[PDB]
Design a protein around this motif. Structure first.
Motif, mmCIF file in Angstrom:
data_model
loop_
_atom_site.group_PDB
_atom_site.id
_atom_site.type_symbol
_atom_site.label_atom_id
_atom_site.label_comp_id
_atom_site.label_asym_id
_atom_site.label_seq_id
_atom_site.Cartn_x
_atom_site.Cartn_y
_atom_site.Cartn_z
ATOM 1 N N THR A 97 -12.083 -3.168 -7.779
ATOM 2 C CA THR A 97 -11.457 -4.342 -7.189
ATOM 3 C C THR A 97 -10.030 -4.094 -6.722
ATOM 4 O O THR A 97 -9.480 -4.934 -6.003
ATOM 5 C CB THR A 97 -11.450 -5.501 -8.188
ATOM 6 O OG1 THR A 97 -10.631 -5.163 -9.313
ATOM 7 C CG2 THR A 97 -12.862 -5.800 -8.664
ATOM 8 N N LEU A 98 -9.420 -2.979 -7.113
ATOM 9 C CA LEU A 98 -8.059 -2.691 -6.690
ATOM 10 C C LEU A 98 -8.000 -2.489 -5.181
ATOM 11 O O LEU A 98 -8.898 -1.901 -4.573
ATOM 12 C CB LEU A 98 -7.529 -1.445 -7.401
ATOM 13 C CG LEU A 98 -7.267 -1.572 -8.901
ATOM 14 C CD1 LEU A 98 -6.753 -0.258 -9.467
ATOM 15 C CD2 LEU A 98 -6.285 -2.697 -9.183
ATOM 16 N N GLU A 99 -6.923 -2.979 -4.580
ATOM 17 C CA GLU A 99 -6.690 -2.841 -3.150
ATOM 18 C C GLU A 99 -5.959 -1.531 -2.891
ATOM 19 O O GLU A 99 -4.947 -1.241 -3.537
ATOM 20 C CB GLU A 99 -5.873 -4.017 -2.615
ATOM 21 C CG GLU A 99 -5.733 -4.039 -1.110
ATOM 22 C CD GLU A 99 -4.945 -5.234 -0.624
ATOM 23 O OE1 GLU A 99 -4.213 -5.832 -1.440
ATOM 24 O OE2 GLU A 99 -5.062 -5.580 0.570
ATOM 25 N N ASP A 108 -4.144 -0.269 2.507
ATOM 26 C CA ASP A 108 -4.508 -1.595 2.999
ATOM 27 C C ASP A 108 -3.374 -2.592 2.800
ATOM 28 O O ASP A 108 -3.175 -3.483 3.631
ATOM 29 C CB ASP A 108 -5.778 -2.079 2.307
ATOM 30 C CG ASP A 108 -7.006 -1.316 2.752
ATOM 31 O OD1 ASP A 108 -7.043 -0.875 3.919
ATOM 32 O OD2 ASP A 108 -7.936 -1.157 1.935
ATOM 33 N N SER A 109 -2.620 -2.464 1.708
ATOM 34 C CA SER A 109 -1.451 -3.317 1.522
ATOM 35 C C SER A 109 -0.407 -3.060 2.603
ATOM 36 O O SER A 109 0.173 -4.002 3.163
ATOM 37 C CB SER A 109 -0.852 -3.082 0.138
ATOM 38 O OG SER A 109 -1.832 -3.225 -0.872
ATOM 39 N N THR A 150 -1.610 -4.625 5.763
ATOM 40 C CA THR A 150 -1.403 -6.069 5.763
ATOM 41 C C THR A 150 0.046 -6.417 6.074
ATOM 42 O O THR A 150 0.320 -7.329 6.863
ATOM 43 C CB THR A 150 -1.809 -6.654 4.412
ATOM 44 O OG1 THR A 150 -3.209 -6.444 4.198
ATOM 45 C CG2 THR A 150 -1.504 -8.139 4.361
ATOM 46 N N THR A 169 -7.535 -13.683 5.513
ATOM 47 C CA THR A 169 -6.184 -14.168 5.291
ATOM 48 C C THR A 169 -5.618 -14.775 6.575
ATOM 49 O O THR A 169 -6.037 -14.415 7.679
ATOM 50 C CB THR A 169 -5.284 -13.030 4.823
ATOM 51 O OG1 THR A 169 -5.257 -12.002 5.820
ATOM 52 C CG2 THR A 169 -5.796 -12.448 3.522
#
Ligand SMILES: CCC[C@@H](C)[C@H]1CC[C@H]2[C@@H]3[C@H](O)C[C@@H]4C[C@H](O)CC[C@]4(C)[C@H]3C[C@H](O)[C@]12C
Ligand SMILES: CCC[C@@H](C)[C@H]1CC[C@H]2[C@@H]3[C@H](O)C[C@@H]4C[C@H](O)CC[C@]4(C)[C@H]3C[C@H](O)[C@]12C
Lengths: 513, 36, 50, 50
Positions: free
Chosen positions: A428-430, A434-435, A438, C1
């Motif tokens: 589940t870690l991003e 990808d961070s 974003t 998002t």
């Protein structure tokens, strides 16, 4: 002494062997070995089996088995007990009124006729007779002959047999009524004795004998004693308690001393029943342990099986009668087996499986065993379905059950004592990339949205929750901008078209794919 | 941020303060939907 | 998002709805495929290659 | 945690907590039936052990 020699040897040599310690000395041996290693001091030098099962066996051992007649007496004792409490509660008036009201409600089709009563010692006729007796007895409370009428009413009431649930409800209702009366009495006693040091002799002389009027308290205030004078301050609460007692007296319709005697008889009978049942179970513990040795390796530890078996026995002993003549060892083994099997099916695996599915799995396993022995090679899901009468999809679903979870410490490395839990990843870690993507997308959107008229930027940020606390609709942004849900759509479309063509939005195309 | 660490015994009140609720059943997850 | 929603609105792209858990050669390896063999459950369709 | 397939992997603490809770609930149930003291004593010994 013996330990001292071993300690001296160990100190001289600094180490000891298993043989030397064992000679000079299962759980007790392990405990002694652990104590010896303490020094490698004073407490260990100065310093039964600890097994919960051995102590249980010991405590059970001090018991005497019962022969065939050894139960009969106990059995009759139990009956007497229950009989007594019946006669103890037959005198309670409100019970018959509640029974009649419940029967009338049942007659109003609110419940089945048979569910109300387990027969009698025809149901409608007996109910009619009961109603006739109640109406002829309630309207004759006049004291002189009323006692005999109430006795006859109760005697005819004895001919009836009541369902255990509602009989226990009536018993509990009477218990709570008595508890309310006793709580009020205890409040009176605490407010009169502790607060004023009121002698017990005065309470016996006044409270006992009438226990209905206020003469025992209100008229005693002028006795010319310090406690009587001090009772003035707490007269309000005592007066309220007396009023409650007088109101309750109307419900009881009997002397409180008689109620106390009835409750004493009920308690004696209940204790007799209890002692008889305990004596019966203590003997049958041996049967319980004997039965519960065929389920050793099933997920539950031996002692849990024994305790579940003990619950079933306590249920049987309450549902056993000597009329049939079944030697307990035949009416009891069934309950023990039922309880143990259900407990194994309820608390034996971490991911609980219902009872019916457990039975299905066991049946499938038995059929598979038979097929394997018979045909020789193996049964396949199609053959299992044919032999077991299932759609061949239920069979696959049952076979797909998750079995039993693997211990997460199962040594799997075999090279550095690695465990299976070291090789399970967090899915589940991003990803850090990808961070960053974003954040870059946010920056690009902020840059682009500043390249159009302020109204367009505000509208786009209002519709899409860009940096806003929440999304908004057309009419809300219209309330914000004093227009009605149409120009807003047009301006939004204009802005999207403006951002659509290149030379204004190209890095966004890079973010897209 | 803290600069020291303290250790002691936990009162029943403290243990009830840490918790967000009481565990009453020994169940873990449904065997069919895999939900808590 | 929010913002990604704006990007989709601007460029009118739909959601994939399916991942890409495909088998690919590990990094740094380079060879030739010499054999492929397919195993299928009993109740399936046996795609052309099988 | 689910592993590949229908299998699972679990820590040993789940088993220990399940045993503690099972015995505690059984003791609470037992104290309502007014069982003989032998049974409640054995139950409390088991709870301490768990
Ligand atoms: C000594 C090390 C033991 C360890 C290597 C052995 C013992 C039991 C084996 C696992 C179990 O079968 C359950 C699963 C079955 C699946 O099909 C493949 C994964 C799965 C975890 C197995 C992988 C491995 O083979 C295990 C962990
Ligand atoms: C010699 C040591 C063997 C070890 C390198 C191999 C043998 C079996 C492998 C694990 C099992 O398959 C069970 C899980 C399967 C999941 O898909 C990925 C995680 C999981 C723990 C696997 C990681 C690793 O690959 C294991 C431990």
């Amino acid at each position: 002494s013996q330990l001292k020699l071993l300690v001296t040897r160990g100190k001289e040599q600094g180490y000891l062997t298993y043989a030397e310690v064992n000679d000079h000395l299962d759980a007790d041996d392990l405990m002694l070995a652990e104590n010896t290693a303490d020094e490698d001091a004073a407490e260990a030098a100065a310093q039964r089996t600890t097994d919960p099962v051995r102590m249980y066996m010991r405590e059970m051992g001090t018991v005497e088995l019962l022969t065939r007649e050894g139960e009969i007496d106990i059995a009759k004792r139990i009956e007497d007990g229950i009989n007594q409490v019946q006669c103890s509660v037959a005198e309670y008036p409100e019970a018959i009124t509640y029974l009649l009201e419940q029967y009338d409600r049942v007659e109003a089709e609110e419940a089945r006729l048979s569910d109300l009563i387990t027969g009698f010692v025809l149901a409608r006729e007996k109910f009619a007779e009961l109603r006739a007796q109640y109406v002829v007895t309630r309207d004759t409370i006049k004291h002189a002959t009323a006692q005999e009428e109430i006795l006859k009413l109760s005697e005819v009431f004895k001919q009836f047999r009541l369902v255990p649930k509602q009989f226990d409800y009536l018993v509990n209702s009477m218990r709570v009524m008595m508890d309310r009366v006793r709580t009020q009495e205890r409040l009176i006693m605490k407010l009169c004795v502790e607060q004023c040091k009121m002698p017990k002799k005065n309470f016996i002389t006044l409270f006992t004998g009438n226990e209905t009027s206020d003469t025992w308290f209100n008229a005693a205030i002028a006795m010319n004693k310090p406690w009587s004078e001090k009772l003035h301050d707490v007269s309000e609460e005592v007066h309220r308690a007396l009023q409650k007692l007088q109101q309750i007296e109307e419900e009881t319709g009997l002397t409180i001393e008689q109620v106390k005697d009835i409750n004493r008889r009920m308690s004696i009978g209940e204790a007799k029943a209890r002692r008889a049942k305990k004596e019966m179970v203590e003997a049958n513990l041996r049967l319980v342990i004997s039965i519960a040795k065929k389920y050793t390796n099933r997920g539950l530890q031996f002692l849990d099986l024994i305790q579940e078996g003990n619950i079933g026995l306590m249920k049987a002993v309450d549902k056993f009668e000597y009329r049939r003549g079944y030697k307990f060892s035949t009416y009891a083994t069934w309950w023990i087996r039922q309880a143990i099997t259900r407990s194994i099916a309820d608390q034996a695996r971490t991911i609980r499986i219902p009872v019916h599915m457990i039975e299905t799995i066991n049946k499938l396993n038995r059929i598979s065993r038979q097929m394997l022995q018979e045909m020789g090679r193996e049964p396949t899901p199609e053959e299992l379905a044919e032999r077991m009468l299932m759609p061949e999809d239920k069979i696959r679903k049952v076979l797909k059950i998750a079995k039993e979870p693997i211990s997460m410490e199962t040594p799997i490395g075999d090279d550095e004592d690695s465990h299976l839990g070291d090789f399970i990843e967090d899915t589940t870690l991003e990803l850090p990339l990808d961070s960053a993507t974003t954040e870059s997308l946010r920056a690009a959107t902020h840059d682009v949205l500043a390249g159009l008229t302020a109204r367009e930027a505000k509208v786009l940020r209002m519709r899409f929750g860009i940096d806003m606390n929440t999304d908004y609709t057309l009419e809300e942004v219209g309330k914000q901008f004093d227009v009605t849900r149409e120009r807003i759509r047009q301006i939004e479309a204009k802005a999207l078209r403006k951002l659509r063509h290149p030379s204004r939005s190209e890095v966004l195309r890079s973010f897209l794919d | 941020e803290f600069d020291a660490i303290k250790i002691a015994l936990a009162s029943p009140d403290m243990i009830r303060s840490w918790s967000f609720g009481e565990v009453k059943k020994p169940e873990t997850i449904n065997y069919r939907t895999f939900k808590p | 998002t929010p913002e990604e929603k704006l990007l989709r609105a601007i460029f009118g792209e739909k959601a994939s709805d399916v991942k890409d858990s495909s088998l690919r050669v590990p990094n740094g390896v380079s060879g030739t495929v010499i054999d492929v063999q397919v195993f299928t459950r009993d109740g399936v369709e046996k795609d052309k290659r099988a | 945690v689910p592993l590949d397939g229908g299998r699972f992997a679990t820590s040993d603490l789940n088993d220990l907590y399940r045993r503690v809770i099972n015995r505690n609930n059984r003791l609470k149930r037992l104290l309502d039936l007014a069982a003989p003291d032998i049974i409640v004593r054995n139950e409390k010994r088991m709870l301490q052990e768990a």
